[PDB]
C-alpha cells in the first residue's frame, strides 16, 4: 500500500486534464494500477508518524 497521505499533504503541480471516458468510470472499470477513493473527508491525512 502506497503512502497516499504523502500525496495529499505535499504540494502539487497544477495540470488541467480530461480522461477520454468519465473520471468515475475510469476508476470503477479498473484502468489504473492502484486506486484510493473516499467520499466526504477522510481524516487520515491529518495523522502523521
Amino acid at each position: 500500500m502506497e503512502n497516499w497521505s504523502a500525496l495529499e499533504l505535499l504540494p502539487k503541480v497544477g495540470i488541467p486534464t480530461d480522461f477520454l471516458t468519465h473520471v468515475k468510470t475510469s476508476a470503477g472499470e479498473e484502468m489504473f494500477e492502484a486506486l484510493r477513493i473516499y467520499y466526504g473527508d477522510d481524516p487520515e491525512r491529518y495523522n502523521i508518524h
Binding site: 500500500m1 477513493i37 467520499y39 466526504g40 495523522n47 508518524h49
Partner: protein, 292 residues
C-alpha cells in the same frame, strides 16, 4: 459515565502496523469489562475464539459484551469511544456484506466466506486482532434461525442422513453474497434454547382457538391461489357454523397466543445495535444511530 476507554499496546508499534490501525479508525470493536483502562489482549475476539467449541457459545459471549467505536491512534495509545444511546455516529463496514438504506443492523461472530483467505489485522506475536460482523437484520435473523433449525433437526439422527441436510442448511445466500456457519456444534445453551422453543410451541399448539385451527382448511375450501396451494402442498401429508363463538374468550385466547409467539420470536431476533441513514456508495462506511 465512562464515556471514554483507553487501551495501551505492550508491544512495539512498527510504522506499518500503526498505519494499518490508522485506516481502521471509526470501526467497531467490543470490550468486555467497560473499565476505563484496558490492556491490548481484550481488544477483539481473539482471546475467546475457539473452533473446537460451539459457535453458539461464541454467539452468546459476543451478544453479552459491550460495543465501542474506534478513534485515531498515537504512540502505544489507542483510544476507544463508547456510544451513547440515541446519538448519531459514523461506522465502517468490517465484513463484506452489502449495506442498504433504512434497515437495521445486528452484531454477530465472524463467518466463513468464499475465498477463506481472511485478511489478518495487527498480528502482534501470537495475538491477533479480529473484528465482529455487523450485519443487516434479514441475514442475521436468517442465520440465527437456521442455526436453531440445525440444532432441532440434527438431534437423534445418524451422520449419514445429517450429512445432506447440513450441506443444504449451512450455506446462506444474501443479497448476491454467500456465507457459511463456521462450527454449528450442539451445546448446552442450544439445548436450553430448544427446551424453551418446545415449551412455547406446545403452549401455542394447545391454547390456540378453534377458528385459528380450522381457518386455513375453510379458506382452502373457499379460495385457490398460489400461496394457498403452497400451504396445502406443505400440509398435504397431514390433511360449518362454529358451535361456539365468544368474542371475549377469543380476545383473551389470542392475547395468550401473542405472548407465546412473542416469546418464541425472542429466541431468534438478536438485539438491534444500529439503525442506518443513507450509506456511502462504496459500501465501506455509513452513518448510523446507536441503540442499547
Amino acid at each position: 459515565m465512562e464515556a471514554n476507554i483507553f487501551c495501551t499496546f505492550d508491544h512495539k508499534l512498527s510504522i506499518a502496523d500503526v498505519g494499518k490501525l490508522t485506516k481502521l479508525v471509526a470501526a467497531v470493536v467490543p470490550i468486555p469489562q467497560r473499565l476505563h483502562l484496558i490492556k491490548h489482549y481484550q481488544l477483539g475476539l481473539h482471546q475467546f475464539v475457539d473452533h473446537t467449541r460451539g459457535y453458539v457459545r461464541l454467539r452468546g459471549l459476543l451478544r453479552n459484551m459491550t460495543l465501542t467505536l474506534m478513534r485515531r491512534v498515537e504512540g502505544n495509545q489507542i483510544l476507544l469511544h463508547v456510544p451513547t444511546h440515541g446519538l448519531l455516529y459514523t461506522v465502517l463496514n468490517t465484513g463484506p456484506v452489502t449495506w442498504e438504506k433504512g434497515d437495521a443492523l445486528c452484531v454477530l461472530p465472524p463467518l466463513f466466506h468464499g475465498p477463506l483467505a481472511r485478511e489478518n489485522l495487527l498480528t502482534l506475536g501470537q495475538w491477533e486482532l479480529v473484528l465482529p460482523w455487523i450485519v443487516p437484520m434479514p441475514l442475521a435473523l436468517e442465520i440465527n434461525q437456521r442455526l436453531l433449525i440445525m440444532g432441532l433437526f440434527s438431534l437423534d439422527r445418524s451422520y449419514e442422513e445429517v450429512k445432506a441436510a447440513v450441506q443444504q442448511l449451512q450455506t446462506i445466500t444474501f443479497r448476491d453474497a454467500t456465507f457459511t456457519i463456521p462450527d454449528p456444534v450442539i451445546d448446552q445453551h442450544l439445548l436450553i434454547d430448544m427446551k424453551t422453543a418446545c415449551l412455547s410451541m406446545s403452549m401455542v399448539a394447545n391454547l390456540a382457538s378453534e377458528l385459528t385451527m380450522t381457518y386455513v382448511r375453510k379458506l382452502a375450501l373457499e379460495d385457490s391461489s398460489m400461496l394457498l396451494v403452497k400451504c396445502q402442498e406443505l400440509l398435504m401429508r397431514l390433511d360449518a357454523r362454529p358451535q361456539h363463538v365468544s368474542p371475549d374468550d377469543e380476545i383473551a385466547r389470542l392475547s395468550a397466543l401473542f405472548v407465546m409467539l412473542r416469546q418464541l420470536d425472542d429466541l431468534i431476533r438478536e438485539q438491534v445495535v444500529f439503525t442506518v441513514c443513507d450509506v456511502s456508495p462504496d459500501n465501506k462506511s455509513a452513518t448510523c444511530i446507536f441503540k442499547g
